[PDB]
Symmetry: C3
Subunit: 144 residues, 3 copies
Amino acid sequence: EELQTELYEIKHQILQTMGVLSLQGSMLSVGDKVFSTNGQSVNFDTIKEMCTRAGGNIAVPRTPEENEAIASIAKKYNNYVYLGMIDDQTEGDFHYLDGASVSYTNWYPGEPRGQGKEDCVEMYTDGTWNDRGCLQYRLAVCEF
Amino acid sequence: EELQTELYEIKHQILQTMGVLSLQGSMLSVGDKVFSTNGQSVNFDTIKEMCTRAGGNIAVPRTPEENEAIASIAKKYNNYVYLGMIDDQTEGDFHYLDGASVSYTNWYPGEPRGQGKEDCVEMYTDGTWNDRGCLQYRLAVCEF
Amino acid sequence: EELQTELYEIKHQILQTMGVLSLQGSMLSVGDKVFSTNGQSVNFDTIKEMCTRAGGNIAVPRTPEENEAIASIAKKYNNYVYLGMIDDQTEGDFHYLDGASVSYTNWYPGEPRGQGKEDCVEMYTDGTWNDRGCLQYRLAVCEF
Ligand SMILES: O[C@H]1[C@H](O)[C@@H](O)[C@H](O)[C@@H](O)[C@H]1O
Ligand SMILES: O[C@H]1[C@H](O)[C@@H](O)[C@H](O)[C@@H](O)[C@H]1O
Ligand SMILES: O[C@H]1[C@H](O)[C@@H](O)[C@H](O)[C@@H](O)[C@H]1O
Ligand SMILES: [Ca+2]
Ligand SMILES: [Ca+2]
Ligand SMILES: [Ca+2]
Ligand SMILES: [Ca+2]
Ligand SMILES: [Ca+2]
Ligand SMILES: [Ca+2]
């Protein structure tokens, strides 16, 4: 019976810290997912490690709203973003990093194409996607 | 019995994140209320939306200590602050945004006056209040 | 039975806020300890008050890993760091601020020495320690 008062305070305090981080542009909240960036431009492998170290994962949009959030960060920092998906196994079918087949997509018209040996996916500042090599310097955006 | 250990860790972690935000000037804590700003100067309506989007509300002091906190942010950013109170209905009696009548006040001597058509309230950098129109650019301060 | 869903969401949200603060360099997490700095260089007494106001304490490393974390902040800001330990009572034996005798140490070779009247401890940017007077301007690093 004293849990409710205890749980309320906990939930309230969490709302406060999330409110502050949100108000100050430190992160974006979309449903249960929080997106954030450290502002750095590094390669795919480095991004993965940065996100993992923080306890999260390299961002990947699974809905238009999530896609738009990531896109907004992309245009805010004026940089393309590496997404949490690859097709290193067989070309054409992309997978999330857990192995599951990609469902929601937002390819720029004609994409994926050009290759060949393009295993990664980048997001343009308008939110559309392009398959690309994994060694370029791109904005690190993480999901928690 | 494993809740206590679980609740302790949760409370501890919350204290940590609040500690960090507090240490770095990201927010101010006064009792159960957290104040924060994104540093922007915008009109009354815009401030309201900014705070609401972050899950909070435009700040309003109900005690001298809360008033002093907001005042400190005001002088830190060298800007006046719109407060969460209006008197758009009948002139003279101000109300919080939920409708309740304003209790604690800190009017600069002679205020409210001048109008007429001044429905909003701004805080000077010394913490005293002035009634003012709602279209000026003022520091956005939110409470959570 | 609805606590699990409630506790999960709480734990998840906490992970999110800690993830964001961590990703952005706002703090360092080592075991159960969080380290953070406001970037300011002030004396020992001022640091203590700054940390206490934020709900934490002036940092003190009790393991090599904690020592390395603090050291990284030290070299990041290119400043030496006052640690949460003193020997104001009798010279030679240092104590944590709760009174307990210091266990883990990492003195630079030859230290402590020179004095005499050196009651505080500073960390060099390589992580080694030096006993020093308590009135110098040093990076404020707090633990939560
Ligand atoms: O499909 C695109 C396109 O061909 C680009 O112009 C090229 O720079 C990239 O290699 C590729 O990802
Ligand atoms: O009462 C004040 C005062 O008259 C000010 O000098 C004026 O600039 C504002 O209109 C008003 O809020
Ligand atoms: O032991 C050291 C050493 O002697 C330094 O060169 C001196 O600047 C300090 O007084 C002391 O902490
Ligand atoms: Ca390909
Ligand atoms: Ca392509
Ligand atoms: Ca009026
Ligand atoms: Ca007036
Ligand atoms: Ca000494
Ligand atoms: Ca010495």
